[PDB]
Design a protein around this nucleic acid. Structure first.
Length: 92
RNA sequence: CCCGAACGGAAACAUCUUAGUAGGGGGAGGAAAAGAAAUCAAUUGAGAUCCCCUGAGUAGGGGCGACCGAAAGGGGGACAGC
RNA sequence: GAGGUAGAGUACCAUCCCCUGGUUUGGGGGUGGGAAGUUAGGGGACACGUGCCUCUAAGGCUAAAUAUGUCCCGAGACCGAU
RNA sequence: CCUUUCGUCUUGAAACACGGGCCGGGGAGUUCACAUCAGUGGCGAGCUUAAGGAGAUUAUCUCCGAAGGCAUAGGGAAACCAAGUGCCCGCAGCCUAGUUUCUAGGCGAGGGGCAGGGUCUGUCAGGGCCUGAAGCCACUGAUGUGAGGCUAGAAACCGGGCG
RNA sequence: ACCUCGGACUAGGGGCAAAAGACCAAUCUAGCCCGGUGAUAGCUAGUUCCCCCCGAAAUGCGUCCUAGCGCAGCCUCCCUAAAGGCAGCUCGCGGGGUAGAGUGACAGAUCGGGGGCUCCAGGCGCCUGGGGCUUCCGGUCUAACUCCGAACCCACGAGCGCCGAAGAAGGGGGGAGUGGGUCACUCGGCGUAAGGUUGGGUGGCAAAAGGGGAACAACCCAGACCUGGGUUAAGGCCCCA
RNA sequence: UACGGGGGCUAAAUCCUGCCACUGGUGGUUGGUUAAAUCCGGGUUCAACCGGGCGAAGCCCCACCGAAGGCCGGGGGUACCCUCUUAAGGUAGCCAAAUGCCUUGCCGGGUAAGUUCCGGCGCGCAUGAAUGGAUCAACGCGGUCCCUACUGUCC
RNA sequence: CCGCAGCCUGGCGUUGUCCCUCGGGCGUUUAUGCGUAGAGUAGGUGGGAGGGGUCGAACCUGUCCUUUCGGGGGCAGGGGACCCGAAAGUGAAACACCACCCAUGGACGCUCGAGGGACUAACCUCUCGAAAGAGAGGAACAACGUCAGGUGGGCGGUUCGGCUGGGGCGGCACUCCCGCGAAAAGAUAACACGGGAGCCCAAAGGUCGGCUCAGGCGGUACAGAACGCCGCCGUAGAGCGCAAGGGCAAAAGCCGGCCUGACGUGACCCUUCCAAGUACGGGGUCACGACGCGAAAGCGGGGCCUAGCGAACGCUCGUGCCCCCACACGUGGGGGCCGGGCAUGACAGAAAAGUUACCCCGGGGAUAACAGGGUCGUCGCGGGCGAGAGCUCACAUCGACCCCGCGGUUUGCUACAUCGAUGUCGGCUCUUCCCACCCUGGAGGUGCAGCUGCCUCCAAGGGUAGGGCUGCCCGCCCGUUAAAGGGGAG
RNA sequence: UGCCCACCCGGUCAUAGUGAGCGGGUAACACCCGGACUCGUUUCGAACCCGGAAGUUAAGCCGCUCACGUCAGAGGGGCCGUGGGAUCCGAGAGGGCCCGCAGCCUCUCUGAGCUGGGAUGG
């Protein structure tokens, strides 16, 4: 697909339809020392089999594409619903 | 007091649990152990330890799965401290 | 009033391992470092700082209150010779 | 005169399926704890004493002992907030005169439907939950769950010894 | 590389094996005994007093699931609740594309003739044969065609009819088994077929004795409180009888 | 204490498993490099120090020598052609082998008949010379086939 | 799927002393600096108009080093005492003193490397020695401990999907969708049939406006059946993204204009999933708010409608706050919500390879193999009919294409019976049955001179061998005989 | 008066349609006049938009006739189902019969526009 860089949509803080910056969604860094991460080593310490099952088989060819819009007039950022696509082209 | 199991359970099973039990080794006594806080808790309080009833399946742990699982305080027993 | 004493590879720290709810927080050990020590230290749920509160280890030793039937008295909605 | 042999598995299969010589004796849904219900009783905005102590003809018994737990308010993670009333239909019973024999009408407990209120959430409608004042204890009972778990039945694996 | 005797040593996930997974005490794809341990069984067999009342399913969805379970439906028992409830029919009023029928009403399938137009081959401008196009006329089929279209089945209202305060629409609660069905008839599909399989509806049987069909789970008659009398059903009536 | 210690295939024995591309040497050269000694110039009041021409042998190069070391494939196509290692591409043998499908290749032996076996010829789908192919002396309670003698195995 | 031994490498400790070249440093020792304008070396910031001054300066004269030989910096004597300005320039001034930074070199005690070397006193190896102790070689290595990484079926535990007309192979009927199945309510099976999806579209989306298609006819240069143009007809025969079904004409089709509603938040409801429980997903109807389109009504939370998709846990993102302790407070760091993404196609979500013919266990006739029953595609046989050949003539005999029947001799399916056993091929012996008659008996026809033939019908009383090859059956063959029939009886 | 006759606004959505022929208009309705302004023609006043308005029943509109399409009625012909039941027939396929219902096609003939709300014309 093709999507323009700027889309006039509603801004919750601006309480009307405003211009926005549109870009793909990117996951953040794993951010070690998380509670869900801390227990991993505390569960991996000692002797035993691979404590947590890990996925090895993959079925879906692609992954869901998500749109991220930022509200220029108030620096707000909104999170949109995902969708399955080949590759979301950001060219206007 | 050291060493240290599998069986099963998770309807599979590997983390986990079954479990510091079964069992090994050492060493006593008629009881042993422990015993005088680097204890608690929290509006500035209590006052060794032990066991009994509660606190309580609460706190908290774990493919958050089966399950495991306190303490503090209160109530009893005798309450000895050098 | 003045002066003095008050326990080291011990606390504590990093790491690996063990276990217990102890979890970024517990205790033990191996390994490496490693203090202060009275004008000392520790502790008061992640770390650090600040104040406030309470204890003083790294040596002892200890009456009773409970664990049990190889045994001895007693009792029993325990059976009558497969 | 009419009549396939017991039990079980089983769509039927029982009669070519299994287990069945005879007799006698033995022999299999129990125990606890929790949860929940029923039935039963005691008390009641309380209930309930445990563990435990004292006295006693001594495990019986009597008194004492709320320790505690459940209910007595819910929402949400929290900071916190935090109700119990108001309409209507209407059973039994009662009252009214007829009782002609009675929904003829009222009163109407209970109950039902619209409400309302507290709470979080949503910017309002809303949405989720709670709220109309009764549970606790004791016995027996039943079922689920955990313990060998109705009875009996395996290859397995492990520890320690003995060849 | 003979054979054998007495002594001695090698221990089980080990020992030995001129090695067959052989032997190691009759126990060897991992020795024995005792203890974990009353291990694990979604499997297999048994499960014991009487009377009486009531009284099923073999289906759907999910499941490393089809030899079991969860949620349903189907049962029994209890309490509350207080006038309606509806397994049938009739009327009224709606829904339908199936049986059938049609193909010039689409989609396709498919047989022939006639007329005209066009091209080619042959023969003497003509004729014949063949090729393409059109028109007209005729016929043959459709689970995946429907211009039409029943019986029929279903919704709702009213009516009829039945049950109902002796024995009660709704609500709550305790306890289950049931998830392998089969056959007969009837309308399908698969397959020629099948006491085959797989669907819709009904009926038994399962759990239903009694009478007939010779005996018999299911075929017909017909639902066993008991004794007795009588009349009858499905069937039968020469003898067995 | 390596003619050893341990580990792996095998089972005795016998026989089959044209080329100078590189090096070495020899011979030579248009041509390039090449030490010591010597000449010239700068520079130094002379010496130390910088560049220019001559510079032997060896090396750079070519050809030959393989009873000099030694070497001597595969693929494409139809035993042969062709690029490269590096020059060519291993002759030869064996075979109805366990290899051959037409099958019982055909024929002969052996019997009345032989789907068994043996041997011979040659159509090699698809042998192509190494942990392979061929090979039987002696040996075997090994397996198959045939003959004699034998004989109640049979009729 | 993995885990643990062992092995290799490296780090740390047992780990000592001299060094040695270089590159790093540690705390020190010191000394070295011109874009232009200007008395002139302003390298860049500070306190600082005072700093030096028998608490020794200006002046010039040389020895000396260096440099962009610009020029400054260090030497005592000759000289016994003087210069910079708060004054002139510089986007930034004082060679007025003392500080910081960059930058060049050497050295001091310590550390690390590229490393290298040496020694012995650790320690190791061996010998002597009763002990004590001594001697010989390697060496701060090795070896051990510990940690990490690589390898690691040497050893240990495990799984080895599901559906299935036995199982495996086969395929996915295992996730969702169209029609048919399917029988005019709904629901309704098949490893039934014909098919699709794991997307694509910033425009293929919203709205407004305009035009009407496929196709055919007549006339015009190139001109053509079909490029364009002018007229006539054309009820969909086109087109609408992707399979099918349906729907659609001033449109949902085609062409332009403007847009981003393919909207945020909170809802109810349909299908999923009938009656009669339920995850997703899709879809519909809303309110609040703001948008966009059009004059407007109004229409727009995606595609004309029906397929285009993923729980817990954990991770990440956005969101405004909330919480972090047995004392409070501060900072950091964490935790929670609410929603989004990261996947599981075995698609209602374990992390998962083969053999066991050395197997073992509890079962299974809910189920394979031999053996009954049902059936008859095949097999054998029969009959109908009759193209054809036989000299003529279908039926003496052969009968093609077709059609209708029988048997349950093999062979195909069926799983009703048997899995706590109905012991499996052949053959031997022995008994019996049947007739679709091989011979023997009777009768007949004949393309029957006679024999030999060929064929039909009746007839099951009797007989129907012996050998070779092959285990058989089957099959080939030998020599006689009347021939050397075929089948049943678990 | 009137009512229907067209018109504007419709409902029914073909019995109301299509095609041809003819008839009707001095109002109504169109045809038709012209574009400077409004607006507008990826050329054009074609069309649309605006300003109009001579002529005119030829279009259209309207009525009528005839054809076809199409709804019904009747006739002829075509074709033929299904519920309910039986130890009825038939081996089966199938069929009859008693109890209840039908419809389908195709030719012939006969009809074939209805109606609400308002300003013109008779």
């Amino acid at each position: 697909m093709k999507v323009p860089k700027v889309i006039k949509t509603y801004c919750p803080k601006c309480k009307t339809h405003t211009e926005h910056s549109v870009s793909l969604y990117k996951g953040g860094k794993r951010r070690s020392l998380a509670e869900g991460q801390r227990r991993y080593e505390r569960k991996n310490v000692g002797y035993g089999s691979k404590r947590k099952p890990e996925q090895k088989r993959f079925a879906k060819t692609t992954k869901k594409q998500t749109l991220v819009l930022k509200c220029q007039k108030c620096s707000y950022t909104i999170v949109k619903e995902g969708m399955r696509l080949k590759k979301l082209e950001l060219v206007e």
